[PDB]
């Protein structure tokens, strides 16, 4: 099952990248300001 699990992991990486690109226009940009 190693090859199937590896392919699933490398698909999950792409899904996470797509979600990262998507979340900027929905949740807004992030800034670090407390001082």
């Amino acid at each position: 099952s190693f090859i199937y699990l590896d392919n699933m992991a490398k698909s999950l990486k792409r899904a996470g990248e797509v979600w990262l690109s998507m979340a900027r226009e929905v949740y807004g940009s992030e800034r670090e300001v407390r001082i």
Partner: protein, 346 residues
């Protein structure tokens, strides 16, 4: 001297023919091995339609396929993918070596992570382990400028190197090719609709395989290395270090230095340098005119499973070539047992 691009085109065509002539059968074996190992019906190719009349019909002979040559290859692929490896920079016996190495392998890691490095490595290793030849490319893209790792598909029929290069890494290579297929709609999407499409001839595929679409066009990128005379300017600003030699590509006018922190000093020393040009060509003319890439070596990186130099020609091998005959004889034995047993039940 061939001022016109036309006269340079047939030289490129002749070089392609010269490179294609010797390295023709080894790539045939590599393609046959990959097709035998992976394609679902590839173990009986060359005898797909075989049979006899049998009284007014034409029954084909029963041909069964029990694939047993892929398990060990899958084991190798799993062993590699379990422990991946990547270029590591080691420091030296200097005062800034450690910090220099840290910055170097930080930048390289960033480039490898924010691009298709993993895909390129995986595909290259898979092709090398299956057929025997693998490759991936290392080009530069703008997004201001960055270096990107891209994979190469069908290396066996897509990558052609200089015939005089005999090293493992093809260091002594003067020119190189990289072919790829394309669809007509993208062909007019890029370039122009005005000229009719023309594709390079190789007589490579359809070699015991079904073809349905003639809608593929073969387009090749071409790499050269040239030694050229270039003059450099040695800026001698006394403040913040004096000696600094730069080439003439960057000028006080091209980049707005305004001599604020730079002095002309001496700008006459001209030295020969090694430069690399890239272009896009087809069977008729130049799709894109040659332009120099920012580097010194051909950005093609070949990967081999097993490689040797036997008789003036490099020969490669993977992990499937040695088990073809026992497998394709076992299949025939199974079929001839099955039909004979089914002939008379009781």
């Amino acid at each position: 001297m061939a001022e016109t691009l036309e006269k340079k085109h047939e030289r490129i065509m002749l070089r392609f023919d010269r490179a294609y002539s010797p390295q023709k059968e080894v790539r045939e074996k590599c393609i046959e091995a990959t097709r035998f190992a992976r394609v679902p019906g590839g173990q009986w190719e060359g005898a797909t339609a075989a049979g006899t009349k049998l009284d007014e019909q034409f029954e084909k002979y029963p041909k069964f396929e029990i694939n047993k040559v892929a398990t060990e290859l899958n084991r190798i692929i799993a062993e590699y993918r379990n422990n991946r490896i990547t270029v590591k920079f080691r420091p030296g016996d200097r005062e800034a070596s450690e910090e220099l190495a840290n910055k170097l392998n930080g930048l390289f890691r960033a480039d490898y992570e924010e691009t298709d490095g993993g895909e390129a490595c995986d595909n290259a290793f898979d092709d090398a382990a299956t057929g025997g030849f693998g490759c991936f490319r290392l080009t530069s893209m703008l997004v201001r400028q960055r270096i990107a790792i891209e994979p190469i598909y069908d290396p066996s029929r897509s990558v052609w190197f200089d015939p005089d290069a005999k090293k493992y890494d093809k260091s002594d290579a003067l020119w190189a090719f990289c072919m790829y297929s394309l669809s007509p709609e993208k062909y007019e999407a890029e370039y122009g609709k005005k000229p009719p499409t023309s594709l390079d001839v190789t007589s490579m595929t359809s070699w015991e395989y079904n073809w349905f679409g003639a809608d593929v066009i073969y387009i090749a990128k071409y790499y050269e290395v040239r030694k050229e005379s270039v003059d450099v300017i040695s800026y001698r600003h006394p403040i913040t270090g004096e000696i600094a030699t730069y080439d003439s590509d960057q000028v006080e006018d091209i980049e707005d230095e305004l001599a604020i922190a730079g002095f002309h000093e001496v700008a006459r020393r001209s030295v020969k340098r090694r430069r690399v040009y890239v272009s896009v060509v087809d069977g008729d003319g130049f799709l894109e005119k040659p332009r120099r890439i920012p580097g010194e070596h051909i950005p093609l990186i070949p990967v081999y499973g097993k490689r040797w130099f036997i008789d003036d020609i490099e020969r490669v091998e993977g992990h499937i070539a040695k088990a073809m005959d026992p497998q394709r004889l076992y299949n025939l034995q199974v079929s001839m047992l099955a039909d004979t047993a089914a002939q008379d039940p009781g």
